[PDB]
Design a protein around this ligand. Structure first.
Ligand SMILES: O=[N+]([O-])c1ccc2nn[nH]c2c1
Length: 302
């Protein structure tokens, strides 16, 4: 039987090798079996996003998120949650809010309700996602436009109050190159926020790579770590082509960075990827471990 990359990465001092999933993955294919055997943390693919959890103001949908949380607890898995404040999965009703006080309270209520429901059960909460433009300026989302840049500090202070046990993360993508301005920009702003006591515990890099981009993460992840958060993480990892070299490079970036607590892949098997044509995950369409998985196993040998 294949070795567990979660157990192997733990044996090297890390916290987890995780995977995104949800109810209908756990009831189909071989996902439940693979997650039970080989992964140590689960994230909700969709079921904790805003459009899934608060489809109208103050009215929440927790059946799907509850299923995942329960399954994780039944199978001794750590749980990540998110994203609490993210423009991409925002219902239209949030986008129409124009009053600063209203959106602030709406955003706080969304954060507090989700985090309170799972209080003490969630290791990591991704509180703010994709807040940056590619040039490193702040993305002009409804939260920035209506609340202003204080929405990020407010989001994290609210999260800390709701569940002090959780590690609070900001996440973004295209943080994979140390020379890309987005990567330095998130570092700059997180240093500034943490100097102001904002409880940003982690930076999570949503790592969607093209073939050959794994090597650059060996420099970009330490740069993210230079922001001084207690933790950084690789999130939503997938790699077009799934070359062993790309994946092992990302893993060794994690191993190289003392503050990097672990890695989360963006699904179990290729056909369930949002870019399945690029066969970018660690298991194929027959749920067989791919060369990249075996290479991670060998790279993590002690
Ligand atoms: O690391 N992930 O795969 C993952 C999936 C969904 C999320 N929502 N917020 N953060 C997330 C991370």
């Amino acid at each position: 039987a294949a070795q567990s990359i979660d157990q192997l990465i733990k044996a090297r001092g890390k916290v987890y090798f995780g995977v995104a999933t949800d109810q209908n993955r756990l009831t189909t294919g071989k996902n439940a079996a693979i997650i039970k055997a080989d992964f140590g943390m689960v994230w909700p693919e969709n079921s904790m996003q805003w459009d899934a959890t608060e489809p109208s103001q103050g009215n929440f949908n927790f059946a799907g998120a509850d299923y995942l949380v329960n399954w994780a607890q039944q199978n001794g898995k750590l749980i990540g949650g998110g994203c609490l404040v993210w423009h991409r999965h925002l219902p239209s009703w949030v986008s129409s809010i124009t009053d600063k006080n209203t959106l602030t309270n709406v955003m706080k209520n969304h954060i507090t309700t989700l985090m309170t429901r799972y209080k003490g059960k969630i290791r990591n909460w991704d509180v703010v996602g994709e807040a940056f433009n590619e040039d490193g300026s702040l993305r002009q989302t409804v939260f920035l436009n209506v609340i202003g840049e204080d929405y990020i500090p407010i989001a994290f202070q609210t999260a800390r109050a709701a569940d002090p046990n959780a590690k609070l993360y900001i996440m973004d993508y295209n943080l994979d190159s140390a020379s890309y301005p987005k990567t330095q920009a998130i570092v700059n702003r997180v240093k500034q926020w943490r100097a102001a006591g904002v409880p940003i515990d982690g930076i999570g890099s949503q790592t969607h790579l093209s073939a050959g981009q794994g090597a650059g993460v060996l420099q970009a992840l330490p740069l993210l770590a230079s922001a001084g958060t207690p933790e950084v993480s690789i999130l939503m990892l997938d790699v077009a082509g799934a070359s062993p070299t790309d994946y092992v490079n990302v893993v060794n970036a994690c191993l190289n960075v003392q503050s990097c607590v672990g890695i989360t892949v963006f699904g179990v098997a290729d056909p369930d990827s949002w870019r399945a044509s690029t066969t970018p995950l660690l298991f194929d369409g027959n749920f067989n471990p791919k060369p990249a998985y075996n290479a991670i196993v060998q790279d993590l040998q002690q």
